[PDB]
Ligand binder design. Structure first.
Ligand code: 71Y
Ligand code: 71Y
Length: 116
């Protein structure tokens, strides 16, 4: 595959991450790691083996931890798939996840075309 530099990935991908943060209120559950003790859900880490959230993805982009853009896409989908796995289909967090995923699909498609 092609080489990607960290600054190039920030320019291309940060707008797609920003679009998720700007979904308000729907991004609020995703702006920080899940805290199962605080949120009253002690089985969370038994169900969700690889936690992920927007702050972690932002830090990885900011510090240059992605070598290529599909690693970023993988982390976004990990975050979404964790929330659809743990939460019931009628719950607020599940519905907010679906909203963010719709926004992401719209934003990421032209960006990955340009990168690829
Ligand atoms: C239902 C639990 C849950 C939340 C969640 O409730 N987040 C809330 C939160 C959590 C912490 Cl630690 C600190 C602050 C805030 C502010 C509000 C924000 O909605 N987020 C997710 C992805 C889930 C689950 C189980 O997938
Ligand atoms: C959707 C964002 C939001 C939440 C919210 O996500 N609460 C979560 C939470 C957060 C903490 Cl830190 C502690 C406990 C709990 C349990 C419930 C739930 O998991 N509560 C409110 C008032 C809002 C909004 C937008 O007014």
């Amino acid at each position: 595959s092609m080489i990607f530099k960290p600054e190039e990935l920030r320019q291309a991908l940060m707008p797609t991450l920003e679009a998720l943060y700007r979904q308000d209120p729907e991004s609020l559950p995703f702006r920080q790691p899940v805290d199962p003790q605080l949120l009253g859900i002690p089985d969370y880490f038994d169900i969700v083996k690889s936690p992920m959230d927007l702050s972690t993805i932002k830090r990885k982009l900011d510090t240059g931890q992605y070598q290529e853009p599909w690693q970023y896409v993988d982390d976004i989908w990990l975050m979404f798939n964790n929330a659809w796995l743990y939460n019931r289909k009628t719950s607020r967090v599940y519905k907010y996840c679906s909203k963010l995923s719709e926004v992401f699909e719209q934003e990421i498609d032209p960006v990955m075309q340009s990168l690829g």
